[PDB]
Design a binder for this molecule. Structure first.
Ligand SMILES: [Mg+2]
Ligand SMILES: [Mg+2]
Ligand SMILES: [Mg+2]
Ligand SMILES: [Mg+2]
Ligand SMILES: [Mg+2]
Ligand SMILES: [Mg+2]
Ligand SMILES: [Mg+2]
Ligand SMILES: [Mg+2]
Ligand SMILES: [Mg+2]
Ligand SMILES: [Mg+2]
Ligand SMILES: [Mg+2]
Ligand SMILES: [Mg+2]
Ligand SMILES: [Mg+2]
Ligand SMILES: [Mg+2]
Ligand SMILES: [Mg+2]
Ligand SMILES: [Mg+2]
Ligand SMILES: [Mg+2]
Ligand SMILES: [Mg+2]
Ligand SMILES: [Mg+2]
Ligand SMILES: [Mg+2]
Ligand SMILES: [Mg+2]
Ligand SMILES: [Mg+2]
Ligand SMILES: [Mg+2]
Ligand SMILES: [Mg+2]
Ligand SMILES: [Mg+2]
Ligand SMILES: [Mg+2]
Ligand SMILES: [Mg+2]
Ligand SMILES: [Mg+2]
Ligand SMILES: [Mg+2]
Ligand SMILES: [Mg+2]
Ligand SMILES: [Mg+2]
Ligand SMILES: [Mg+2]
Ligand SMILES: [Mg+2]
Ligand SMILES: [Mg+2]
Ligand SMILES: [Mg+2]
Ligand SMILES: [Mg+2]
Lengths: 116, 101, 70, 87
RNA sequence: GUGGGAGAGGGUGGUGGAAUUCCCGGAGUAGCGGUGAAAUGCGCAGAUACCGGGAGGAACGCCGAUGGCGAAGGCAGCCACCUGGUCCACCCGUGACGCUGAGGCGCGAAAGCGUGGGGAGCAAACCGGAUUAGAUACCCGGGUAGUCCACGCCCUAAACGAUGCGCGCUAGGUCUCUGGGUCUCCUGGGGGCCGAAGCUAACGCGUUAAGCGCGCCGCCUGGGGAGUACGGCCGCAAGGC
């Protein structure tokens, strides 16, 4: 009910999960998916196969919205952070460009004990 | 009195009345603090690398001056108080260190 | 690979306003290039870093950028 | 701070003879000038401790030179002290 | 003295972007988070993800080094001001004015104390979830003091180069920071690495001495008892000498 025909795709990948949000050219989201949206529940959500399935499910929902041309934004690191982009390439969506926009601070905040 | 370089980045969208007004206000600030104006370079419209005050562009000014030291910070404050002036960087003048001479 | 200073003129390392030549010393991202790729001396690099930061605060050089093709 | 104008003024004021630069009198004069400058800088900025250590060392050097002067010629020592208002 | 130089040396004020958190709004469904697995937890009062706006605190990515500065503790965005130390060249001035230094005095990471502010993130104590024979721990979710600032205390440390300060003498080679020079190089002054002689119980040190000497200060005399007791002094206390 939107007929967007083009937009962005953000891939947020961590070591616990990978989620994909397909949005429109001025930033508002259209659809999304993740390792928990699909069947997987626990650490299974962080596997590259779950990332592939999440990307494919989000891409098919975007097809339902009528998406053809997609620009890719990537933030984070984890298993399947690349597999998401591979499935997104071979999903039937013409990939416009891939961009890694992983937010990194200029050393402002103190991390948790795990990250030091 | 030391030699300084005042960089002024202000709103680009001004028309001539507003721009001349802001420039003459900068002039009056330079007068009131004892700033002898040695030279001036007005670049104007320029493409910023990152948006400043929600605007992707800015209007540039550069003044090489000679003024007393203890007044530089107060002059910078008075220059900043103006709304349309978005950036004020006063820099002590230096000699042109070259490279690949 | 070519180092920045190798292909360049007799330019001012203290001019924070010349974006044309200071852009050469930034990476694909907004990061300052190491001495391995700039071919500068320690003193030259130390001056270039401060001039680059000055240009950044004046909105002339990017504080950070986005990586492509990743 | 201390520019060449003020420095040369003091040196030409405290010289034993035209051209003299490193007399004990001139050394103590320039020392006392920097001493007063720093101590006025330390009236404000009570948390500037490294400059205070510098001031301690300057006081020590000035006191050593004054002790030497008093040992060699007491009269010139009295003249210097009265001229600078110390001790 | 003159003339140059490098620097996260210190203090004060200003100021920039990234990120976290929170708030407003837009768009958008069903999970997010987390782990070796999980669960507490958060989510239909609309989260997570995405976009725009606002607020606030703290810390300064790339540059960055095996680098620099400082007496030590220690010191990294940028700008301005106030200020310390130091190096080099000129061979100009004074004419032994030097070295060390019991006591004294000052400085002194972090944590801790007092009064008043501040509070994002982190986080002793604490509250829960797990794990386990048990879990008072490691792992996960919260969370106060604190961490931050002003002022006044506290005087400890693996406060380490486990190497007191100063001066002279004794092969070089290599990398480096910073000056000067007639600039394949030389000559100072710092930071490393090999290694002459020599030293060392050995490891190792070796012109940055742990070598050859001189001056002065501090300290040592088997381990446990014990940095305890008593006494004194200092401290609001903790406690310190
Ligand atoms: Mg997970
Ligand atoms: Mg303004
Ligand atoms: Mg500094
Ligand atoms: Mg400072
Ligand atoms: Mg909302
Ligand atoms: Mg609920
Ligand atoms: Mg619930
Ligand atoms: Mg608040
Ligand atoms: Mg680094
Ligand atoms: Mg040093
Ligand atoms: Mg200085
Ligand atoms: Mg002579
Ligand atoms: Mg003589
Ligand atoms: Mg001494
Ligand atoms: Mg003592
Ligand atoms: Mg302390
Ligand atoms: Mg503390
Ligand atoms: Mg307190
Ligand atoms: Mg926490
Ligand atoms: Mg915890
Ligand atoms: Mg239990
Ligand atoms: Mg000894
Ligand atoms: Mg040279
Ligand atoms: Mg050397
Ligand atoms: Mg060597
Ligand atoms: Mg031997
Ligand atoms: Mg060795
Ligand atoms: Mg020695
Ligand atoms: Mg020995
Ligand atoms: Mg003892
Ligand atoms: Mg015994
Ligand atoms: Mg004890
Ligand atoms: Mg007794
Ligand atoms: Mg007692
Ligand atoms: Mg008592
Ligand atoms: Mg104790």
């Amino acid at each position: 009910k939107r007929q967007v025909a083009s937009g962005r795709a953000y891939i947020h990948a961590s070591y616990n999960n990978t989620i994909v949000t397909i949005t429109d050219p001025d930033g508002n989201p259209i659809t999304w998916s993740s390792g928990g949206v699909i069947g997987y529940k626990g650490s299974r959500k962080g596997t590259p196969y779950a990332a592939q399935l999440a990307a494919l499910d989000a891409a098919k929902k975007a097809m339902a919205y009528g998406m053809q041309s997609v620009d890719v934004i990537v933030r984070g690191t984890g298993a399947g952070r690349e597999q998401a982009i591979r499935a997104l390439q071979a999903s039937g969506l013409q990939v416009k460009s891939i961009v890694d926009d992983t937010p990194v601070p200029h050393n402002g905040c103190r991390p948790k004990k795990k990250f030091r | 009195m030391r030699r300084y370089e005042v960089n002024i980045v202000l709103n680009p969208n001004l028309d001539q009345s507003q721009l001349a007004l802001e420039k003459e206000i900068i002039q009056r600030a330079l007068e009131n603090y004892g700033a002898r104006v040695e030279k001036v370079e007005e670049l104007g419209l320029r493409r910023l690398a990152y948006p400043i005050a929600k605007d992707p562009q800015g209007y540039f000014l550069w003044y090489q001056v000679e003024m007393p030291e203890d007044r530089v910070n107060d002059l910078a404050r008075e220059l900043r108080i103006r709304d349309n002036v978005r950036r004020v960087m006063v820099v002590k003048s230096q000699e042109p260190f070259l490279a690949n001479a | 690979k070519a180092k920045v200073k190798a292909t360049l003129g007799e330019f001012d390392l203290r001019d924070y306003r010349n974006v044309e030549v200071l852009k050469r010393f930034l990476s694909e991202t907004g990061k300052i290039l190491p001495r391995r790729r700039t071919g500068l001396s320690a003193k030259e690099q130390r001056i270039l870093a401060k001039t680059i930061k000055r240009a950044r605060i004046l909105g002339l050089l990017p504080f950070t950028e986005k990586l492509v093709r990743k | 701070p201390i520019t060449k104008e003020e420095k040369q003024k003091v040196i030409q004021e405290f010289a034993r003879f035209p051209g003299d630069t490193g007399s004990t009198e001139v050394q103590v004069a320039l020392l006392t000038l920097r001493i007063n400058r720093l101590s006025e800088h330390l009236k404000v900025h009570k948390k500037d401790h490294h400059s205070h250590r510098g001031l301690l060392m300057m006081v020590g050097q000035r006191r050593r030179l004054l002790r030497y002067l008093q040992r060699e010629d007491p009269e010139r020592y009295r003249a210097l002290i009265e001229k600078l208002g110390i001790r």
